[PDB]
Amino acid sequence: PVPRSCAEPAGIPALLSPRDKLAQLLVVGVRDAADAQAVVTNYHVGGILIGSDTDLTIFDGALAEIVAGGGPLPLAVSVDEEGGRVSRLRSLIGGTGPSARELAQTRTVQQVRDLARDRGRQMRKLGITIDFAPVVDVTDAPDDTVIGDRSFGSDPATVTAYAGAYAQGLRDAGVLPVLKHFPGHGRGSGDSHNGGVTTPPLDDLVGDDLVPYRTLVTQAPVGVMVGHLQVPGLTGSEPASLSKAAVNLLRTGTGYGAPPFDGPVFSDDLSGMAAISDRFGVSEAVLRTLQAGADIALWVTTKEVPAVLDRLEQALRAGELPMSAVDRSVVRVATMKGPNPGC
């Protein structure tokens, strides 16, 4: 029972208990209407994910009530909608369409902006507020590989032009675009989803994989998703999503030729991906990613939420996580969500 408020984002923390502040930083995948309604009513999570196993009849009237009942700001609703091989809402917004790789080869930059805006418009009518796209990974790997045709090209300038157009299209329609996967999955050693993955050395990334970010992180609003990527010279054997050194590079920008970034930062999926779940249980993974400076801890099921919040409250009392860090992220997510209607 968390009532809506007209307070400005910087002040939103004063309104909330510590448990509810923590809950604002969680985004979870849901099974259906009932699962989503229960997790929001009972635990007050900041958002939900329309994931691969989500029953899409949730859009038929259930969602608007679920959103209407949450507080103190509008519930976040997110989805994987890249097009081609990754298009959760294909049944509803006009099909998969072409892949990213196919787009950059067969349509202009402006036509790509057109398509993103139309698809984004249809997504916003359904209730979507966040799309985990565009991919800004750079690669020339085969179509069906883990990134493959999900990439706009093998050249950074090409990716900056086309991923930039896609993000602007979504932004045109009032949907938050999210660049992924920082600091570059395109030449990773494998698939994050069933094992540990390493990038080329940091120096190589700075001159190649990271170049699109230098200009795209400045075009607000925009989020950034950090991959489960081990980076030589930056993170050691820790995935980037759990590494404060990696998030700090994103925050400062200087080290790869970018201005600083103060927008919302998302972990990649913490539960369903072996790169994390081989080494960490869910509540420990959530603690780590918030310790790193991520604002949103993301995973694909609801059942872990009571345990996760218990562990995070423990971390607060034992000093494993300082309240200044929680408050700073709560302000970022309020800013992302925007004001309540009626204010």
Residue numbers in the entry: 46 to 388
Sentences from the study reporting this entry:
Despite the absence of other known PG-recycling proteins, we have shown that LpqI is an authentic exo-acting β-N-acetylglucosaminidase, which is able to cleave PG fragments in vitro. In previously characterised PG-recycling systems free amino sugars are produced by NagZ, which belongs to the CAZy glycoside hydrolase family 3 (GH3). The β-N-acetylglucosaminidase sub-family including all known NagZ enzymes utilise a conserved Asp-His catalytic dyad, which has been well characterised. As a lipoprotein LpqI is expected to be found attached to the external face of the cytoplasmic membrane, which is consistent with proteomics results.
To test this, we cloned, expressed and purified LpqITB using an N-terminal His6-SUMO tag, which was subsequently cleaved from the protein. LpqI consists of a single TIM-barrel domain similar to cytoplasmic Gram-negative orthologs but lacks the C-terminal domain associated with extracellular NagZ enzymes from some Gram-positive bacteria. Superposition of the post-cleavage NagZPa complex with LpqI indicates that the appropriate coordinating residues for MurNAc or 1,6-anhydroMurNAc recognition are intact in LpqI, supporting its role in PG-recycling. The only detectable activity for LpqI was with GlcNAc-containing substrates. The Michaelis–Menten constants (kcat = 2.0 × 10–2 ± 0.04 × 10–2 s−1 and Km = 72 ± 5 µm) of LpqI using 4MU-GlcNAc as a substrate were found to be similar to other NagZ enzymes using this substrate. In a similar assay we were also able to show that LpqI releases GlcNAc from soluble PG fragments, including PG fragments with a 1,6-anhdroMurNAc terminus. In this assay, LpqI was not observed to release any soluble PG in contrast to the muramidase mutanolysin. Together these data support the role of LpqI as an exo-acting enzyme involved in fragment recycling, rather than as an endo-acting autolysin. From these experiments, we concluded that LpqI is involved in amino sugar recovery but is not required for stem-peptide recycling. In contrast to inhibition of P. aeruginosa NagZ, deletion of lpqI resulted in an increase in survival in the presence of lysozyme and all cell wall active antibiotics tested.
